[PDB]
Design a protein around this ligand. Structure first.
Ligand code: G58
Lengths: 12, 243
């Protein structure tokens, strides 16, 4: 998986 | 009795969780309103009630990630482990936070400032009795332990640093990060209730209970799918609904 939306939250 | 290092560690967790929490209170007048009154056979109102809940769930996930990022140790793990730990912990921390907001006198959970709901309301939000009864049961058992802010904050940190989660590539590091928080909670509980040595075990046992409840929720999720799913993207991504 990319888990794009969780990564977005982790990024800032 | 707490070392100076432990007091600082706990102060920062409690402050970290208050900062994460006030960010949520900023966007309370932005969640779909809970239908006030409304004919009980209105399908629009049924839709609004479901959306309200899934939007509170989204805010809860934002609080959790925001807090995790402030737990010392967490951002030093690899990115993929960060993701693996958050994917597994999210439901469990959501349930600890629900337990913290349970009122035993009135048997109702208050989300954000004043979104107070009973079991009937959880059912009207689209949840099944198989999930609702445990949630309230777990909340009721947590209530009797009488946890305070420091204890919740520490238990959450401990829960995040569970080495055995699926897809964690460096479990040695994760378990090593769990130890200072376990030890801080061991010392904190020993000072707060110095006569009750079984309070600390009774709290760690809740983490066992949270594993089962995690499965009960995955059944609820697969049950939504077989009846008009419609969970928002962040939630269906985290909980692996489609991929
Ligand atoms: C049918 N259906 C409707 N909603 C769902 S949910 O999966 O999105 N979930 C809703 C949910 C999840 C978490 C919270 C929550 C937890 C802590 C703090 C806050 S707060 C507003 O103080 O920030 C909100 C509220 C609703 C179902 C659900 C619960 F209610 C309760 C606990 C866990 C879950 Cl997992 C399924």
């Amino acid at each position: 998986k990319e888990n794009a939306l969780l990564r977005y939250l982790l990024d800032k | 009795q707490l070392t100076a290092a432990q007091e600082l560690m706990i102060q920062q967790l409690v402050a970290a969780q208050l900062q994460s929490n006030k960010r949520s209170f900023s966007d309370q007048p932005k969640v779909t309103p809970w239908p006030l009154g409304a004919d009980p056979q209105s399908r629009d109102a049924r839709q609004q009630r479901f959306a309200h809940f899934t939007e509170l769930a989204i805010i809860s996930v934002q609080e959790i990630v925001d807090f995790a990022k402030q737990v010392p140790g967490f951002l030093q793990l690899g990115r993929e482990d960060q993701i693996a730990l958050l994917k597994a912990s999210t439901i469990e921390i959501m349930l600890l936070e629900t337990a913290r907001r349970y009122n035993h006198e009135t048997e109702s959970i208050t989300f954000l400032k004043d979104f107070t709901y009973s079991k009937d309301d959880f059912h009207r939000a689209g949840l099944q009795v198989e999930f609702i009864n445990p949630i309230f049961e777990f909340s009721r058992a947590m209530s009797s332990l009488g946890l305070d802010d420091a204890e919740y904050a520490l238990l959450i940190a401990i829960n995040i640093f569970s080495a055995d989660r699926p897809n964690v590539q460096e479990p040695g590091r994760v378990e090593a990060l769990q130890q200072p928080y376990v030890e801080a909670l061991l010392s904190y509980t020993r000072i707060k209730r110095p006569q009750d040595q079984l309070r600390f075990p009774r709290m760690l046992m809740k983490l066992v209970s949270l594993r089962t409840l995690s499965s009960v929720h995955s059944e609820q999720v697969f049950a939504l799918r077989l009846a008009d799913a419609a969970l928002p993207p962040l939630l269906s991504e985290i909980w692996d609904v489609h991929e």
